[PDB]
Design a protein around this ligand. Structure first.
Ligand SMILES: *C(=O)C(CC)(CC)C(=O)Nc1cccc(CN2CCN(C)CC2)c1
Ligand SMILES: *C(=O)C(CC)(CC)C(=O)Nc1cccc(CN2CCN(C)CC2)c1
Ligand SMILES: [Cl-]
Ligand SMILES: [Cl-]
Lengths: 850, 850
């Protein structure tokens, strides 16, 4: 077999080639309809059953905004109904413009109002039809689908006026009174009345003028680790029901997280304003050090019969958070029971091996008092029966994977709570469990004076029915959740039962759980939303050949059996763009690993495959936890450049090694305490399977490339298996696990003290001497302003490479964080990546160079 | 002519080759005898006339310490006297060691006490024989050559004890009382009595506990710009004479600079402790912004007859510094007249085009008072006659070059001061001028209430005799100074009269200045010290072939003419190592530039020069002001790797372009406002002269490499003349002149507002689009912790290169400042530099790669 050498293009020629292939790919950067809501018309005379609201991007270079579509009562099954997108909102037209201006100073200004005025999410109040949403700086409201009815034309968004000097974040409607909204301003919670215009600051925890070294406190906002490592952004939750006062007014309540980051390590990331030559101070809990001091607080808001604020009482926990919630480090999730009788929270220990679900009575909260005399009176005025109620507690020798599934049923019995919750802890696969918990009066008496025993708040489990089971998981992360039909007593859920390469929508009874019914067509992976009324569901679906598509499906039963659930295609929302020109999909393959697992992979055959010729091989890798790269989804948008590599004459390989997502907790836990030590074996094992099966794979010229965990494994690969991998391009790599944060590192590797050898062997920076003594094999890429994987990882690694006398190549993106945003940086990266592979792997110059 | 291609060594092979050639070069990193002092024995019976003291490094891996040598009354002129080095000090042996330890825990500890306990400079008090010197942390004293006599054995250094918690800096003997020393501790001035042990803080300007954002004040210490750009480190000066009190005690005085850096821009340089991921706050006056607020203060120290402190009165100027010294930005130099009647200062305006020499009476200083009532009394109690006296004022359309020459004669007449001073301002060459200035009572009266006119303090010039003249300069920087023989009425000085490639020692009368007599042998460049007694001088001399050598020379006259001065070789201090093996010196060449100047250069012919073969050419460059690379000095130590390049088969060229040092102010001022715009023309012009003269220079394969201004011109070269320069390796380059400091940038380029186009065209970062679209031509090297040329220069330049879509190669040294210290970094740099030139210029792979 004679070796194939890629065409050796100049830098200018490659720049043009990459620009040419990018030109017809402008429509791709445009968000598909999401955040769906079904509102019933209730119009016997009218042709429509439901109006659906949703966020979407009408096209390329356009604003993510609110649209609505009409769901007919009947369809012509001969034809294919394509729903029209009606804009819910009028063109904002940024107010306080005035000036004079002209056509030449206005048609250029309209280009600047694209990325700014875009809606990321919205709130809705069914009873009033009130929409609340942030759009750029402003917080706006409109009404549709409530008592006022249904508009046939775009509505003008109503600016919520403010005296607040800074940007208002995280706006939320009060479910108990849609005249009242809350929002965050300079790390404190405010409320505002969209009718009376009354604006009121609830928390006085942060002073914007003060230094961050001094002022380390915030309220209603999730800290770094919770946003980046636990996918939680909001830190405050409205009580969904109001308490009527004797005066004829009401009490509105907000549960909120209060964080003190005083003892959290301060690091300095370079200021984006590079001319200043300054750095921003940042609270980064590096593994082994202090997380923020977290507690629960409640804001009690007394409103009179006319809707004016009487008083605001800030309340703290009767005892310290550390006493009431022994061994809890993280508030992963929080909210209210539907009646708002209890606040709930999903709490985690530092090791992230113990999850607790805790009901917190508002009665646990007493007014904040400096006077210890008056304070001691308030403590005693609260009964001993009032206590935190741990309605659930699970453990695992691997780790708790936090999800968004948790449905609380209406409280029928006084001393019982009934809920659905997902868990991997029982069978090592995420399954739905219906649990009933007895709300026992605690054996612990607060009056006695002693501290509580580890399990004095634990509630007995009356019932724990498994709703699902098997060698497959229910999905509860990154949009995946459940819809509970409390009427027909069903639960709709996404899962991997039919294949781990395809997400599918299933339905099943939660009273007499039996046969699980797939509602989505095989041959596609599905992301699904189910109507609150459980008579419709939308699917965002793709496969390897066909771009993403959004269709609506009506649910019904056979006349004779309401248990049996069927679906019928109703209408298309977003039509698929269809097979993309100059994109060849990859082939999904698999191989029986000597590890006892099936490992899946994607293979990109070189375009215009010549017979009896071996080609250079780029292995694209991530290989870290919480990610699956290999599945039956369209890859021609996100991983379009793996196709471009193939077109230039590269074999491209992707392998989901042990640790990957959607295969169960055991397959994931494979590398617990051992990160870096097992991933490249699985990559080589899969790479050697392909080489024996296909003769066109040249193992003499294998490249490896990845970002984040991919860049980390790219370095580990050149370090461990220089016999396999000629070149390694490492993007934003983790080089030293003691530098990375608490939430991620401790979850997979434990505390540094209890895994000295795991941390050492897992850190590439500590093994610089093991890198090749040949240049043109190692290339480091890093954004200079990266907040997640700091540039320090690279700079420390380089420091040790210089000591060890090893060569390296380096590219910096001075104005980029982790994810490259500014197009010029992305174009330069793509250009340099191809040129490097060309010059140091692909071409014949590369072969002569050794 | 067939092109020569260098041997293509592996990275490991080059590493070994560079280590092999570095092995026999350990003795080179060892300081030659310096800081000479001559003390007369006055021993009619004894064989010695003088004892000489000096700092030196006995050998490689040894401590810079005090030695002494004996100067005989007569020499055997048949033989060559080689003076023996007698150690003045006993082995320090760091006290407070205690512990237990052993031979294996002590013979390893002695390795750690090499670089630590080293003496950089020393003070001496002739009258007492008292030596004062910092050695590591401690401040020590010994006695020799005073009333106590001359030791024949090493003396034990006496630790000056302290209560100060931090390192004491900048120790100085009080010339009026050698029991008293002063020093800096945490940016404040202290005094300490080495007999009574009394320790007293004089200034309360800085609090170490406070933040540098808040606490921006310091006393007795030169700020960043003065240290880095004006070669001044000390900020306080003892009055050389004490004032006897009526009590039988005395008043000692310290003039000091007090700096407020409050309004100076704060930048963040990465912390050397890379694991912290923190940055150090730093006061960097970037060009166009505020310099420190500077003023003069005087500490008045009342001592009783027994030597105990009575009181300490801190005094400020009677009027603000800005009022008394109109338009003065920089205190370049300061001191006292020999009698200590006046404090003197050399003051500069922001543009550095006006120099003033000002006498400041102690009477100008009044006690510091908060009470405006008591303060107004003190102002009025000082006469109007007491006023600042500007004894000299010069200007230039180019710039003032600050030097260390300024000799004040004993004050004979009451209203006259007589002094020698050097200046380029008259003839455009630095020449010695004897000036007499009339100390007129100022026309300005402070009582009147008005502010003074620009020139109310100007003293009339009674006399201004030119002592030297011609197309050659007197040397007054970086060790070069004058010795004035007040007896024979001569001045000894260094100059370039015989050649601009050789420094020489000259003598001349300053009463009847006539014929200038060279005292040093032609065929060498000389660095000279002249005995205070003016009957001896030492020369540190080298040429291109012969390593540095230190010899002593006795001065005398012919019997018949004391005006005529001759020299006789007396003894050798440091013997030359002699021609170094595997080092070929370069040839000094010159060419008549179309600019109307002779430009000098060095040429390294390729070793084992093959006939009828053209070789690849590396142009090594600095090309910035205040530096001459080309002269008749040994280059086999500092520029040894230019020889290593030659040995691998590279032509190496060095050219002192216009702007270079030692050619006069006009030749230097060539690029005023125009930095970057003229240097590469001169480099190409010289490169094309060599190519027409020698056929072995291949102009197809020219590389360029430099650091600081060299790295800057290396980028300018690839930008302006990509037709000449294939590759450019830029080390710590200035890429953007608005980022560099006030003292340097404004001196050569003026204020940014009055040179918009000079700054723009002079900044490579603003012209990224003009770089080549071919890779493997541009390489950036930078220390990550550089305090002088910040990494920002590189990071901004890269930012614009990414926008322009241009390729680049990059090496960082994460633990290095401007000058690479840690050997591993230097080894890696040398290794990568050769490998890069090999792969992208030298070898045939480089030719195939285009
Ligand atoms: C890199 O791999 C990194 C840091 C950016 C860890 C070193 C990482 O990927 N972290 C991470 C944290 C939380 C969730 C996820 C998974 N997430 C990644 C993005 N895709 C599109 C969805 C899932 C990763
Ligand atoms: C670089 O060239 C730089 C910064 C380090 C200016 C951009 C510079 O060289 N500055 C500089 C400042 C003051 C004096 C000198 C001259 N000095 C350099 C070292 N040699 C050995 C003695 C003379 C340079
Ligand atoms: Cl139920
Ligand atoms: Cl005189």
């Amino acid at each position: 077999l004679e070796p194939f050498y890629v065409e050796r293009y100049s830098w200018s020629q490659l720049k043009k080639l990459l620009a040419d292939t990018r030109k017809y790919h402008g429509y791709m950067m445009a968000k598909a309809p999401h955040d769906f809501m079904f509102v019933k018309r209730n119009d016997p005379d009218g042709p429509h059953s439901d109006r659906i609201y949703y966020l979407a991007m009408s096209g390329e270079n356009r604003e993510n905004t609110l649209f609505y579509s009409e769901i007919p009562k009947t369809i012509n099954r001969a034809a294919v109904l394509m729903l029209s997108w009606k804009p819910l909102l009028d063109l904002f037209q940024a107010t306080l413009d005035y000036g004079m201006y002209s056509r030449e100073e206005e048609l250029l200004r309209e280009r600047k109002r694209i990325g700014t005025v875009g809606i990321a999410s919205y709130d809705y109040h069914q009873g009033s039809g009130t929409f609340l949403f942030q759009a750029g700086s402003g917080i706006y409201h409109v009404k549709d689908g409530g008592p006022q009815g249904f508009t046939q034309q775009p509505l003008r968004p109503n600016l919520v006026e403010t005296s607040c000097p800074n940007i208002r974040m995280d706006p939320k409607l009060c479910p108990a009174d849609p005249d009242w909204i809350a929002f965050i301003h300079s790390n404190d919670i405010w409320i505002s009345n969209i009718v009376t215009r009354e604006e009121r600051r609830l928390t006085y925890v942060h002073n914007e003028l003060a230094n961050m070294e001094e002022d380390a406190r915030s309220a209603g906002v999730a800290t770094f680790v919770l946003q980046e490592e636990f996918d939680r952004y909001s830190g405050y939750w409205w009580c969904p029901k109001a308490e009527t006062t004797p005066s004829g007014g009401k009490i509105l309540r907000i549960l909120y997280e209060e964080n003190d980051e005083s003892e959290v390590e301060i690091i300095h990331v370079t200021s984006p304003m590079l001319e200043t030559r300054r750095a921003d101070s940042f609270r980064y809990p590096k593994t082994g050090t202090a997380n923020p001091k977290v507690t629960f607080k409640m804001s009690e808001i007394m409103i009179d019969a006319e809707g004016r604020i009487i008083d605001v009482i800030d309340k703290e926990l009767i005892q310290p958070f550390e006493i009431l919630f022994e061994g809890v480090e993280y508030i992963a999730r929080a909210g209210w029971t539907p009646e708002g009788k209890y606040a709930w929270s999903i709490l985690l220990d530092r090791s992230q091996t113990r999850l607790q679900i805790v009901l917190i009575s508002p009665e646990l909260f007493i007014p904040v008092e400096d006077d210890v005399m008056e304070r001691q009176r308030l403590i005693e005025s609260v009964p001993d029966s009032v206590t935190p109620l741990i309605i659930y507690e699970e453990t695992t020798d691997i780790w708790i994977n936090i999800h968004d599934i948790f449905h609380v049923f209406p409280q029928s019995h006084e001393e019982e709570i009934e809920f659905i919750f997902a868990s991997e802890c029982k069978t090592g696969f995420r399954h739905l469990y219906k649990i009933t918990s007895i709300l026992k009066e605690s054996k612990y008496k607060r009056s006695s004076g002693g501290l509580p025993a580890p399990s004095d708040f634990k509630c007995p489990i009356k019932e724990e029915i498994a709703i699902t089971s098997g060698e497959w998981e229910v999905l509860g992360r990154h949009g995946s959740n459940i819809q509970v039909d409390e009427v027909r007593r069903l639960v709709y859920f996404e899962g991997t039962k039919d294949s781990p390469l395809e997400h599918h929508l299933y339905v099943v009874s939660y009273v007499n759980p039996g046969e699980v019914t797939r509602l989505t067509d095989r041959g596609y992976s599905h992301s699904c939303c189910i109507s609150q009324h459980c008579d419709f569901f939308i699917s965002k679906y793709s496969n390897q050949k066909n771009p993403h598509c959004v269709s609506l499906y009506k649910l019904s039963s056979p006349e004779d059996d309401p248990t049996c659930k069927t679906k019928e295609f109703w209408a298309t929302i977003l039509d698929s763009a269809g097979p993309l020109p100059d994109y060849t999909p990859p082939e999904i393959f698999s191989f029986e690993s000597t590890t006892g697992f099936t490992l899946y992979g994607m293979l990109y055959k070189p375009h215009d495959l010549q017979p009896g010729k071996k080609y250079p091989t780029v292995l694209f890798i991530y290989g870290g936890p919480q990610v699956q790269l290999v599945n039956n989804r369209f890859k021609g948008v996100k991983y379009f450049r793996l196709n471009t590599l193939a077109s230039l004459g590269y074999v491209v390989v992707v392998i989901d090694n042990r640790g990957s997502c959607h295969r169960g907790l055991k397959f994931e836990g494979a590398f617990k305490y051992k990160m870096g030590q097992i991933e490249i074996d699985d990559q080589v094992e899969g790479l050697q399977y392909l080489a024996s099966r296909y003769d066109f794979i040249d193992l003499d010229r294998v490249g490896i490339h990845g970002w984040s965990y991919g860049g980390y494994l790219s370095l580990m690969a050149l370090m461990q298996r220089s016999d396999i991998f000629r070149v390694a391009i490492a993007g934003a790599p983790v080089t030293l696990w003691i530098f990375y944060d608490t939430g991620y590192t401790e979850r997979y590797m434990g505390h540094p003290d209890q895994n000295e050898q795991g941390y050492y062997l897992g850190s590439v920076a500590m093994q610089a001497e093991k890198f090749p003594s040949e240049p043109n094999r190692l290339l480091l890429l890093h954004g200079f302003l990266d907040e997640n994987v700091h540039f320090a990882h690279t700079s420390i690694l380089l420091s040790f490479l210089v000591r060890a006398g090893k060569p390296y190549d380096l590219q910096i993106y001075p104005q980029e964080r982790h994810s490259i945003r500014v197009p010029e940086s992305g174009e330069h990266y793509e250009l340099h990546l191809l040129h490097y592979l060309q010059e140091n792997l692909g071409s014949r110059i590369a072969a002569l160079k050794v």
